[PDB]
């Protein structure tokens, strides 16, 4: 009866983490069936990290150039190719722990579980969301390169993120499991900056519903509003403009509680202009924006995996 930042049990992903080493450059790899996925940054050398011409650096590499380790065992690579910012190293051993899975490109505002890894070994797992500016407020030190983000559906693991770098904002950027980057970022050590970020309005509302579902509803009011009038107050506070599509995503939550989305907005509009007034929602003093309508459903219905 306390709303914490629940992460998906990570066992299934832990059994796919391997260490990849190219010379003296080491990082994490994702092992599914007879393939290992990792950031191409691995074939980088210390003096060539500013504008590494990957296509060229890869040409002078051979399967022997890659040292893929899983525990004490060494996975023999028998093939290598590049796909956007990732390398696909074929190995002679199909991963015995491969879980049913999918690769999916997540959208801004959505969330996933991150398994922070170092030297191919899992250190911790936490929740984060894909910020509207296409970055993620995570916790990664050097060596975390390769760590992956994921979700779960019944039995399927949906890999959606592979970490690559940290921006001067202290924020992070990565790719989908196809190597394409989220946002306008490139995997080189140049001067790149995150765009200004906004509050995920969709998630704040999801959160509010969660508050209500747990019986914490003092903030509710007797009125309703328009998307226009709401967005107008929203931009003052830097909120993501709310769309009709967003409204429909909140459909299940809205139906479970029977509180129309625009009604909740009117409550949020009032919650922004006035404030909580010492009051707390779900034992919190701030308006949470990193809980998707799915997470809310997931945590309140004790969904298992």
């Amino acid at each position: 009866s306390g709303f914490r930042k629940m992460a998906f049990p990570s066992g299934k992903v832990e059994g796919c983490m391997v260490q990849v080493t190219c010379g003296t450059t080491t990082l994490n790899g994702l092992w599914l069936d007879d393939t290992v996925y990792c950031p191409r940054a691995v074939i980088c050398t210390a003096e060539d990290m500013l504008n590494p011409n990957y296509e060229d650096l890869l040409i002078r590499k051979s399967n022997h150039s890659f040292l893929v380790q899983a525990g004490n065992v060494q996975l023999r690579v028998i093939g290598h190719s590049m796909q956007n910012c990732l390398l696909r190293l074929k190995v002679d051993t199909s991963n015995p722990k491969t879980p049913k899975y999918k690769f999916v490109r997540i959208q801004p505002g959505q969330t996933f579980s991150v398994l922070a890894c170092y030297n191919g070994s899992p250190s911790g797992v936490y929740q984060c969301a894909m910020r509207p500016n296409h970055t993620i407020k995570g916790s990664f030190l050097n060596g975390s390169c390769g760590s992956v983000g994921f979700n779960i559906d019944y039995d399927c693991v949906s890999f959606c993120y592979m970490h690559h770098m940290e921006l001067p904002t202290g924020v992070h950027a990565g790719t989908d499991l196809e190597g394409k980057f989220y946002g306008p970022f490139v995997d080189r050590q140049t001067a790149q900056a995150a765009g200004t970020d906004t509050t995920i309005t969709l998630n704040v509302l999801a959160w509010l519903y969660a508050a209500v579902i747990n019986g914490d509803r003092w903030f509710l009011n007797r009125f309703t509003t328009t998307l226009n009038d709401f967005n107008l107050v929203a931009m003052k506070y830097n909120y993501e403009p709310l769309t009709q599509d967003h409204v429909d995503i909140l459909g299940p939550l809205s139906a479970q509680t029977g509180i129309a989305v625009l009604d909740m907005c009117a409550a949020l509009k009032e919650l922004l202009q006035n404030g909580m007034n010492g009051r707390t929602i779900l034992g919190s003093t701030i308006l949470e924006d990193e809980f998707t309508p799915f997470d809310v459903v997931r945590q309140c219905s004790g969904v298992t995996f």
């Binding site: 450059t25 080491t26 950031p39 691995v42 050097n142 975390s144 970490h163 770098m165 001067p168 080189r188």
Partner: peptide, 11 residues
């Protein structure tokens, strides 16, 4: 400032 590719070192 400039971004950072967060790879590691093995020795």
């Amino acid at each position: 400032t400039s971004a950072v590719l967060q790879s590691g070192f093995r020795k």
